Design a protein around this ligand. Structure first.
Ligand code: A1I53
Length: 128
């Protein structure tokens, strides 16, 4: 399923080309502007440990997740991945620890050296 499909078929969107962040577009977005660093961005997401063992959704708060792009208010993989997305796009991200919580992890939610999977829909972005 989705994590393995990203491993096998994802595009490497890292500058380093170390496969730290792999992407597949699931549904195409509208127009051709992606957000610029500093933009306030609005998403829905479903996430989990690649293990499948914990799971997490914006829908659980019943409202979109908002943050400011590339100001590291989210993991590096999100600052990277979301920057590549067009409005209304849905993407799958598979993320090595180096672009998430690293060998330190973030307990109790995230263990050491965890690979994370997300499905992300980009709803909108505004130039804060
Ligand atoms: C480690 O702490 C959490 C992780 C996540 C959800 C949490 O609560 C909703 C959470 O505690 C609140 C702090 O948030 C941390 C940052 C902002 O989170 C992110 O960078 C990323 C990407 C943006 C959405 C949340 N992300 C997460 O890593 C989730 C995580 C939970 C377990 C399954 C894998 C995803």
């Amino acid at each position: 399923g989705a994590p393995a499909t990203v491993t096998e078929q994802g595009e490497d969107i890292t500058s380093k080309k170390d496969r730290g962040v792999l992407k597949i577009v699931k549904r195409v977005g509208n127009g051709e502007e992606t957000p610029m660093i500093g933009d306030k961005v609005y998403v829905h997401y479903k996430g989990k440990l690649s293990n499948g063992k914990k799971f997490d959704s914006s829908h659980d708060r019943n409202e979109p997740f908002v943050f400011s792009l590339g100001k590291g208010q989210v993991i590096k993989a999100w600052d990277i991945g979301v920057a590549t997305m067009k409005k209304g796009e849905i993407a799958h991200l598979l993320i090595k620890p180096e672009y998430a919580y690293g060998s330190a992890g973030s307990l109790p939610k995230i263990p050491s050296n965890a690979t994370l999977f997300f499905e992300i829909e980009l709803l909108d972005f505004k130039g804060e």
